[PDB]
Every structure is written in structure tokens, then in C-alpha cells.
Amino acid sequence: SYTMCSGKFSIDKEMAETQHGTTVVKVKYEGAGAPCKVPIEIRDVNKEKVVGRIISSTPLAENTNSVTNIELEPPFGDSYIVIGVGDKALKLNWFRKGS
Amino acid sequence: SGMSYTMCSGKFSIDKEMAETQHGTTVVKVKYEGAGAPCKVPIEIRDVNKEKVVGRIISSTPLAENTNSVTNIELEPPFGDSYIVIGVGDKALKLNWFRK
């Protein structure tokens, strides 16, 4: 339906835990080609891809300078979340404790 | 343990049209016209139902090594109509493949 956003993102609101064991982050799309899909990759402690942990139904950047809400269920341990493409990609770290 | 690259933001073009191989796969060759290389080639494969299709990328994770570099991409697309998208943005290459 849509293609992935080629542009830059910035943090509108810092990543935060929710009441039900998920995380939310708000991001601002500074680039062009909107409406486009927000690129999101989640990797685990070994930098292996982790699938199906994106709770929000596929995140879009609707316009230029639009703000997008992103809900995730990151996995156990240290996870690495990358948003966007290219050099300017946002790189976020999260830690979740388990058994 | 390995290199950590990001996805290529730039434009791609077809260096060589998608073609069937002798061993039940396809190959396509693509040229990276953009910047930030070496970066990862964005590749998505969807089926007739527009549903993601997993583990059909045979090539070990495809990279664009340099600017104007040519990357060989081997895939095992599913039966029927598949939709392959390469790169990001408006200029993303959109390929429709039909397999019998």
C-alpha cells in the first residue's frame, strides 16, 4: 500500500513504559514522501531480528513534521530499537527483566 | 557478532531484470545510486493477499557495498503473483513476479 519513509526522524517524546508491560515512543517525521511507513527494526541482545513485537498497527508518518505514536512489546533483556533508515536513523536501547 | 549496518535510504535501479535460475529460484541484480554505502538493501516480499512472506530471501543479507555498486539478489518467490519491493521512499522499485 505505502512505501517506507526515506527521511529523518526525531524523538518527539522519550520511550516510556506503559501500565500493561508495553512501551510507547512518539516520533516526529522531518523528511518527505509522506504518507509513508515508519521503518522499525527490533533486535535482541545478540543483534538478531525479533519479529511481531510491534503492537501499533503499521505505523505511518501521515505528513511532513507529523508525529507518530509507536507502541512496542520489546523482549526480554537488552533490546535495540532502530527507527528510520540511513546514517541519521534513531537508535534506542531498552532493557526488560525476566525469570 | 558481525557488522552492523543500517538500511539504504537511497534510490535503486534495475541493473539486470529478474530472472529464473536452474535451481528453483530467481535472481535480480540491482544498482545502488544513493549514498551512505555500505548499507543494507531494503527488501519486502508480499504474496497475492498482500501478506508478508517470510524466509524467501536466499542471499545472505544483501548489501550495497559502494555508491553505484551492483548487488546480486537471490530469492525464492512463492507460487502465483508475488510483489517485491526494493528500497524505500517514492522511488522504491516495485516488481511483480509470477510463478507457475
Full residue range of the structural domain in which residue A61 is found: 1-99
Return all residues near A37 (Cβ < 8 A) that are at least 6 apart: A2, A3, A4, A5, A58, A59, A60, A61
Number of domains in chain A: 1
Tell me which method was used to determine the 3D structure: X-ray
Nearest to A47 among B4, B36, B88 (CB): B4
For residue B18, what is the enclosing H or E element?
A: strand B12-20
Residue of B nearest to A85 (CA): B7
B86: its cell numbers? 526494493
Residues 6 or more apart in contact with residue A22 via CB below 8 angstroms:
A55, A71, A72, A73
Closest residue, chain A, to B7 (C-alpha)? A85
Residues A42 and A78 sit within 8 Å (Cβ to Cβ) = no
Helix ranges, chain A (H): none
Integer Cα distance of B34 and B8 in angstroms: 8
Resolution, given in Å to one decimal, reads 2.8
Residue with cell 535480480: B28
Whole-angstrom distance, CA of residue A99 vs CA of residue A90: 30
Asked whether the beta carbons of A24 and A55 are under 8 A apart, the reply is no
Q: Do B88 and A1 touch (CB under 8 A)?
A: no
CATH code where residue A33 lies: 2.60.40.350
| Residues facing B26 on adjacent strands | B20, B75
Q: Is residue B80 within 8 Å of residue B45, measured between CB atoms?
A: no
Q: Which residues pair with B75 in a beta bridge?
A: B26, B57
Strand pairing category for B63-64 and B39-40 = antiparallel
Say whether B92 and A4 touch across the interface (CB within 8 A): yes
Q: Do B90 and A5 touch (CB under 8 A)?
A: no
* Among B7, B43, B84, the residue to mutate for chain A (most A Cβ within 10 A): B7
CA of B4: which chain A residue's CA is closest?
A47
CA pair distance A82, A40, nearest whole angstrom: 6
